[PDB]
Amino acid sequence: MAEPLLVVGLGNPGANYARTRHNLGFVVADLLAARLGAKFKAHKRSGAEVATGRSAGRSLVLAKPRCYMNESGRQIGPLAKFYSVAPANIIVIHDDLDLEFGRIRLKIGGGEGGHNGLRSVVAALGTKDFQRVRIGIGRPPGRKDPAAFVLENFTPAERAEVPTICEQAADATELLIEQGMEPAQNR
Template identity: 55%
Template sequence: MDDNLWLVVGLGNPGPDYAGNRHNVGHMVAAVLADRLSANFKNHKTNSSVAEGRSFPGGPKLVLAKPNTYMNVSGGPVAALLRFYSLQPARLIVIHDDLDLPFDTMKIKVGGGHGGHNGLRDIIAAAGTNEFIRIRIGVGRPPGRQPAADFVLKDFASTERSALPNLLTDAADAIELIAAEGVTAAQQKFHAP
C-alpha cells in the first residue's frame, strides 16, 4: 500500500441528464481535480470511472473516482475501490452535496452520521465505518414546500451558476491540501472563523 495515496470519491448520478444537478456537485469537483492533474476518467472494474495523478511531482497520489451507480447505491463501488487500492477508510475523501449548508459554503468533516444523505448512508454501510473524510458542499434548502429529493435533482439556478466555479475550485483546493498537509490544515484555511 502506498501511504501517500488518497481515494477521492465524487458522489452523483451517472449520465448527462444529471450532470448539472445539485446532487452531482461531487462529480463536478472530481472533474475539476482531474483537469488539474491532466488525468482522464476511465471505466474501472469497481463499477466506477477512475482518474489518477499527482498535484505536484513527489506529492500525494490522488485516485479520483465517480461511481457508475446512482447516488443511493454508491457504497458498493466505494468499498470495492478501497479493497482494490488496499486503502483504509481513513484515506477516503467523499465529496457530496449538503442541504444543511447554505449554497456557496463548504465544510470539511471527519466521521459522523449520514445526515439523511442516502449516498453517505450506503457508503457507511458498505465500508463498515463512518470514519472517513467528507467534503460537504452546501446547496441550501429547497424553497417553500418543494421536496428535498426534487430540489437536489434540479440544476443549479442561473444565479448560483456564476458562483459555482469558485466553490468547486475551493473544494478541489481543500482536497489537495488535505492530501498534502492533513485535515486540520484544510479546516483552518477553509472554515470561516
C-alpha cells in the same frame, strides 16, 4: 504515509443530471483529475471510472461511480478494497443540505445530512469515519421534497457561482491532501 488516497466524488450519471445539486462531487472530481493531468479509465473490476494522480507528493486514486447515487457504496466499497485504502484515507466530496449555499467545510465522520449517496458509502464501508469535502447547497425553499431539490438544476442566480464554488472545493480537497484537519484551516 507510503499509502494512497481515494478521492471519491458523488453523483448520478446522465446528461440531465450532470448539473443538478446532487452532482457537485462529480464536477469537483472532474476538476481535480484535470488539474493532475489525470484521465478517467473505466474500472471494470469495481464498476466506477478511475483516474490516478499525484498531489502534494501523495498517491491519488480518484473515483466517480457509474450507477445511481444510491449504490455508490456498492462500487466504492470494492474499489477502496482493490487499491487497499483504509477508510481514513478516503475523501468523499458531496453536496450538503445542512450547509448554506457556497460554504465548504471539511470533516471526518459526523452525520450524513440525508444524503442517500453518503449513506450508501457508509453502509458499504461499514464505518462512517472517512473524510468529507462538504459543499453547501442550502436547505430547500418552503414546501419542497429535498430528494427532488437535489435533482433539480441550480437557479440562474446560483449557477453563476457554482463554477467558482467548485474551484474553491477542489482547492479545499487539495489542501486537505497536503495537511490534514490542520486544514479545515482557512478552508
